[PDB]
């Protein structure tokens, strides 16, 4: 039993814990969210196929680590699903050939939000997997640890729904122009969704986000969002109806709006949050 | 929040 990652990097086998860096592409699925499919990331083989067969299981106590430590879900191991953190030893995967074969493991998370996410930066711990290796000819029985680290920055969805982008930047035309905000949401199965805006506002209507531009800021103006011509105040939930597997636009447009006193020339910036809720 | 929108603009005289 000897393994390497997708880019060909050796994983030292057994003895001390190994830190294994993998690419992940998290996604919402029906009833659970993929955190990482390791079957595309870890490939193993047997250097003595003619005479030895290797067996590898995933042991009890395997679990998420780091920022995912508090979450639970499932592990798909060799085509079957089990609770994660693991509460029993899985059946084995067999390695006989010198030809590489995937380690057939994918880790899933039980949704707890509507469209939330947890950022995982490259270099961060994802999971701690405990493996047990045996064979078909002697008593060798050894357990060892693979600490799975992110090779790339991702956001793990924690809900039933996911968004086109977690961070969106738009540029208005020169005042008094407006611009659509490209932002959509979809769900793994149909869900009834709403959303609301968060941020600091400047007006009696709680609907003009303050201009927080750092350099040479304009005075007397802020940013106001509309949907089909209707102003959306902060912290007032908008309904999206039922959102299925195809993306549904939030329908947002950005505008400038006056906050009082004279409008003066300069830069404008507003940072506005969007939060989804089930309805 | 779930998404952060950064809106940039400019007032020109």
Residue numbers in the entry:
A (entry chain A): 1 to 279
B (entry chain B): 1 to 13
Sentences from the paper on this structure:
The adhesin FimH at the fimbrial tip specifically binds in a catch-bond mode to terminal α-D-linked mannoses of N-linked glycans of the receptor uroplakin 1a on urinary epithelial cells. FimH is a two-domain protein, composed of an N-terminal, mannoside-binding lectin domain (FimHL) and a C-terminal pilin domain (FimHP). FimHP possesses an incomplete immunoglobulin-like fold that is completed by insertion of an N-terminal donor strand of FimG, the subsequent subunit in pilus assembly. The two-domain architecture of FimH is a prerequisite for catch-bond formation because the interactions between FimHL and FimHP determine the conformational state and ligand-binding properties of FimHL.
The crystal structure of the binary complex FimHF18·DsG was determined at atomic resolution by molecular replacement. FimHF18·DsG comprises the jellyroll fold FimHL and the immunoglobulin-like FimHP domain complemented with the FimG donor strand. It closely resembles unliganded FimH in the fimbrial tip complex, with a root-mean-square deviation of Cα positions (Cα r.m.s.d.) of 1.1 Å. The DsG peptide in FimHF18·DsG is in identical position as compared with the N-terminal FimG extension in the fimbrial tip structure; it interacts with β-strand 2 and 9 of FimHP. All contacts in the FimHL–FimHP interdomain region 17 as well as the conformation of the empty ligand-binding pocket observed in FimH in the fimbrial tip are preserved in FimHF18·DsG. Thus, FimHF18·DsG represents the ligand-free state of fimbrial FimH, with Associated FimHL and FimHP (Afree state) and is an elegant minimal system to analyse the crosstalk between ligand-binding and interdomain interactions underlying the formation of catch-bonds by FimH. In the absence of ligands, FimH adopts the Afree state with associated FimHL and FimHP and an open conformation of the ligand-binding site, which is responsible for the 30-fold faster ligand-binding of full-length FimH as compared with the isolated FimHL domain. The results revealed equilibrium dissociation constants (Kd) of 3.6 and 9.9 μM for FimHK12·DsG and FimHF18·DsG, respectively. The rates of HM dissociation (koff) of 22 and 58 s−1 for FimHK12·DsG and FimHF18·DsG translate into dissociation half-lives of only 32 and 12 ms, respectively.
